[PDB]
Amino acid sequence: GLYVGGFVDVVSCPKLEQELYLDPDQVTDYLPVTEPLPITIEHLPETEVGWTLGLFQVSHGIFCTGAITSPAFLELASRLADTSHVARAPVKNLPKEPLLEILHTWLPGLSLSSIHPRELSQTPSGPVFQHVSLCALGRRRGTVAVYGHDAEWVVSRFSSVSKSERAHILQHVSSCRLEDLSTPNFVSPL
Numbered sequence: 001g002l003y004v005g006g007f008v009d010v011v012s013c014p015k016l017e018q019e020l021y022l023d024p025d026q027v028t029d030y031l032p033v034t035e036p037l038p039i040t041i042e043h044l045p046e047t048e049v050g051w052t053l054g055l056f057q058v059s060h061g062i063f064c065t066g067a068i069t070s071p072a073f074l075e076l077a078s079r080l081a082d083t084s085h086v087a088r089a090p091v092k093n094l095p096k097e098p099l100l101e102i103l104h105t106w107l108p109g110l111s112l113s114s115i116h117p118r119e120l121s122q123t124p125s126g127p128v129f130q131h132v133s134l135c136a137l138g139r140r141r142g143t144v145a146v147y148g149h150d151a152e153w154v155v156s157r158f159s160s161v162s163k164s165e166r167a168h169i170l171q172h173v174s175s176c177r178l179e180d181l182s183t184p185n186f187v188s189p190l
């Protein structure tokens with residue numbers, strides 16, 4: 001399996017003219033989000049690679065846990081990890097887990113798409129959040145994303161998340177199962 005975790009940036013209209021990064025306190029009333037949102041790359045809808053497992057308010061911000069489940073993506077990324085000089089160039093030499101290191105390096109940002117704050121003054125009508133994207137650019141408040149084969153290992157890499165908060169996060173990561181979720185839409189260009 002592949003899991004991803006980290007603190008997110010909250011962004012309205014990502015990659016558009018009206019792009020607006022939100023202070024996390026503007027959306028904490030609408031957390032936690034336990035139901036799965038798509039995980040895409042750089043806010044491109046045709047690059048779904050997995051599903052979120054939880055978005056939680058913790059002390060230092062908003063933490064996301066996700067599962068990367070697309071077999072096409074996993075196979076392609078693993079192959080590039082083992083064969084692509086470009087993918088490996090900016091990573092430490094000869095890592096034991098090249099797929100994890102390449103993802104951590106090339107897609108360090110977690111970006112949570114939100115509706116615009118004007119919708120949050122009142123009571124919003126529909127879903128406040130749309131998706132989480134793995135991003136090469138745009139990280140501000142978010143931390144560098146951690147990729148791993150177990151969810152416990154991934155969350156345990158953030159010393160800024162208490163054992164207590166870790167337990168709360170991992171509680172739901174285990175409750176909401178993955179196998180039943182639909183296959184993400186990513187198509188390998190190879």
Ligand SMILES: O=C(Nc1ccc(-c2nnn[nH]2)cc1Cc1ccccc1)c1cccc(CC2CCCCC2)n1
Pocket residue numbers: 041073076077080087102103106107136189190
């Ligand atoms: O421009 C990028 N990639 C890119 C562009 C064109 C084609 C391509 N077009 N035609 N044939 N191949 C193929 C790829 C590789 C790709 C593979 C898996 C998911 C999306 C992209 C790009 C830029 C920044 C970050 C990333 C994330 C990558 C994730 C997997 C490991 C390597 C980094 N990718």
